[PDB]
Design a protein around this ligand. Sequence first.
Ligand SMILES: O=C(O)CCc1c[nH]c2ccccc12
Ligand SMILES: O=C(O)CCc1c[nH]c2ccccc12
Lengths: 102, 102
Amino acid sequence: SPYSAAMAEQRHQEWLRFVDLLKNAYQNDLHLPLLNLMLTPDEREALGTRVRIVEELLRGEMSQRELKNELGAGIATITRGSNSLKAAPVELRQWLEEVLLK
Amino acid sequence: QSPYSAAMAEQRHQEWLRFVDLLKNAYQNDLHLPLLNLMLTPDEREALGTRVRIVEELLRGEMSQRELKNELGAGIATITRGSNSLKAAPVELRQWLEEVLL
Ligand SMILES: O=C(O)CCc1c[nH]c2ccccc12
Ligand SMILES: O=C(O)CCc1c[nH]c2ccccc12
């Protein structure tokens, strides 16, 4: 079954292999061509927009509807971003607030 | 406001490079795994794990179309797009991938 625990374990090891591959691509200065190979153009654009969503949610000045109109993202996308930021570990959120809100 | 413009193409490039730099620092701070969990949906993370195996098998050249669809669940359209991306990749990236993946 595709929802089995053994399949979730295979997906996890495949994901960690990508993370390690990307880790060493940065060390070899090959991260830009590898990300161009592994991601579609729309996936790269979404990642850039999601950084802005994280920044504005952390800042708390703009409303979610306001966020939707400046970036062209739906309300559902904004809400899923807020869900993900809420579930993020404290150590990550603390670092993001120092980087994106300086 | 229209996404098809030289001004918006420049904005998309800066937003992408900002995520690239953010992820580079996360690797150096060992926050890459929670950052990637924050910025990607689980189905996107699963696809990236699968695309590594597609690249591996395309470079190896042994798996056939039925095997690629049976083992990786990748249809003909996905393999074709992955092949297109690999053909566009610079040699230096392809040299390195054949070393670390095989
Ligand atoms: O639209 C989606 O499905 C992606 C939602 C999403 C996941 N992580 C995110 C981080 C910031 C902004 C949005 C998101
Ligand atoms: O649309 C898709 O299915 C993703 C296509 C795609 C981009 N880079 C890839 C690398 C390996 C395999 C597939 C891909």
